[PDB]
Structures are given as C-alpha cells and as structure tokens.
C-alpha cells in the first residue's frame, strides 16, 4: 500500500522544467536553448520503508537543443543539438552529473557552441537536477 511508481510524474516535471532553459537571451550572437526532452528512461519509484519514504531513482535523460553562434563574419549560423546525461540519481552531487554534448551537422564554424553550452546552460541543469529529488519526495512522498 506504499510503492508508487513516478516515472510518469518525473517525465512531466522535467518536460516542464527543461524545455525553455537557455544559454543567452536569443539576441546575442552566441545563443542556445533546449528544444525539448527527447528521452527519460530509468526508474523513479517511491517506496515507503519505515518513517522514511524513499526513492532510489536513477534516470538517464536526453534533450534537444536549438541555437546559433558567432559566424565567420556578420549574421549568425544556426545549429541542431542534443545533450545526454547518463545519470540523475537519488545520491547525485551537483558535480556528479555528466553532460555529453552533441552537435548535429557540426562544422569547425560551430566551435563556440559547446563552450557556450558548458558555461551557460549546464550549471542551470545541475541545479535543476539537484532540486528534482526534493520536489519529488515533497509530492509522492507524503500520505
């Protein structure tokens, strides 16, 4: 009468939290923004053993990213992308998270994309992930 899967709720939470996060504000020459959450696999169960209700959740999350950077001269050239984080778990530390950044149809002229992602979009996802656990138990973790 306690085991409550949440793979469902987490799928909604991240979709509602990730989509929209950006590395800039559209204007800048170098800009990036997450287009959507393509995949959320793993397990997000919430068990209730003893006064403590818990979840040994371990999720693999992937998302799509839109953006444009500093072209060779004037106007900025666009790019498609994805970011894979193999593990967002109950015992993750802000720094535990790994971000595999991939650029679709990447050209030596899309160099500044990744740097832009690493220093501007990642520390946001790291804090977004750190919060997940709380907002998770805060819900499906009480009567």
């Amino acid at each position: 009468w306690v085991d409550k899967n949440c793979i469902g709720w987490a799928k909604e939470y991240f979709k509602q939290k990730l989509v929209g996060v950006e590395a800039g504000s559209v204007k800048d020459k170098k800009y990036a923004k997450i287009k959507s959450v393509s995949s959320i696999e793993g397990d997000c169960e919430v068990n209730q053993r003893k006064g403590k209700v818990i979840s040994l959740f371990d999720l693999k999350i992937t998302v799509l990213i839109e953006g444009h950077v500093d072209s060779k001269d004037g106007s900025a050239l666009p790019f498609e992308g994805s970011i894979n984080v193999p593990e967002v778990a109950f015992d993750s530390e802000a720094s535990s998270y790994q971000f595999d950044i991939s650029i679709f149809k990447e050209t030596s002229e899309l160099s500044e994309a990744k740097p832009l992602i690493r220093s501007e979009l990642l520390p946001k996802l790291r804090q977004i992930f750190q919060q997940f656990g709380k907002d998770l138990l805060a819900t499906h973790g009480n009567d």
Partner: protein
Amino acid sequence: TKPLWTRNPSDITQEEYNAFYKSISNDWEDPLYVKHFSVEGQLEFRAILFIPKRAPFDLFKKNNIKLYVRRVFITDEAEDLIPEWLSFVKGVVDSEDLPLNLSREMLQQNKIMKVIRKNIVKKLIEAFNEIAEDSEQFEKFYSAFSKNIKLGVHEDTQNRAALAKLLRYNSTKSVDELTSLTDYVTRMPEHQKNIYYITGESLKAVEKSPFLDALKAKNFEVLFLTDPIDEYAFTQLKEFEGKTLVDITKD
C-alpha cells in the same frame, strides 16, 4: 569473532587488513590498497575491497567478492555485483536489505543490486584517485591495471570522464615518463583547442610518423596511443575537460 569489515576503518590497522586479504586471496604480497567504506540512509551496506599489487595469472572465475546479506554469507560468485572490467578486485560486500532467493535475473538485475554496483564502482574510482596521489604506488597500479582502466572508459558512460583522468601516455613532449591528460591540457596554449593524438602498433613506429612534423611545427603536443584498445577509448570519450580529442591522421 566480530567481522572485520564492520569495525570502523580508523580502528583497524594495516597489519589487520593485510591479514584479512591473505585469508581470502592466498596472495603472498600485501594488498596494494584497501578501501573500506560504509553506506547508510535509503541504502545500507558495507564493503572492504582490495587492490592487488600484481594482475592475476590469466591474461584476461570472478568468484572474488564475497556477498553477505546482514552478516550471512550467500555466494562468492555474485553475478552483476561488480562490472567485469573490475574483476580484479578482492573483498567482501555486506548488504542490509536486498531480498533473499532470487530467480536468476532477480539477482542479476535487482534494483538494490544495481544501486550497490554503482556505489562500489564510484568508490573504487575514489580509491584509484587516492592511489594516483602516490607516485610510487600509482606506477605499480597503472603497470598492472591500465588495461582495465581502459575497458572502464569503453563502457561506463557515467564514469568515463573520471577514469580518463587515470590514463597515462608517452607524448611528443614527454618521451621519458608517461604523462596524463591533465598535464597535457595545462601545456596547451590558449589558441590550441584540441588534444591531439596518433595511434600506432608500437612506440617506435609512431615517433617517426610523417604526420607529426606539422604538429611539431605548431608546437602542439601529440599523444602516442599504442595499445589496441586505446583508440576506441578515445572515440568513446570524445572530449576531455572541454577539449576535443583529435586523431591527427583523419578529418
């Protein structure tokens, strides 16, 4: 007699660990390193893992680690408790929860089991890092398990980066001492945005490769990868500390 792995690792002596190791390994030498830790909270369990000084006999039974559930030995051949590339580790793992009697898969895919596997892997990496701080102890480690560290990069997408920090190579800027990727980066001028490397069947072969002259001309260091499984590790890693890995004989 109170099981050693349950006492506080700061109330245990090296003379003691050595002893315990010998009784479970028949080894004649003292373990290269001991990592004794405990995990509590949602997941509870203790472990005492050993890192031998040498590699075992076979080039490449796994009945190393002894699995105990609430101090009750279960099996010395627990499948899925430690990843194969970490098969060289010796020791015992004691888990507080974890159901009993698991029909094949429910023992080799159990949710609790999967969690414990990741902690041990995380823990040993922490251990590997400590060892790397001890030059003399490290050289002994890398000469014995560099391969394993490589296989670890191959498959662990979550730890891939951490382990890459333990890799060592001979570069054009380091012929008499393997160098790490970290040092490589430090030696990288700001306009250099790529960690360069070349693969080859042997050191002699690559040192005189006609591809180096142009890199040397830009005074760009070039890593020498001479083991058969090195290249796949690099293509599996893709980048290191924000810098791209690039084979100087391709795009």
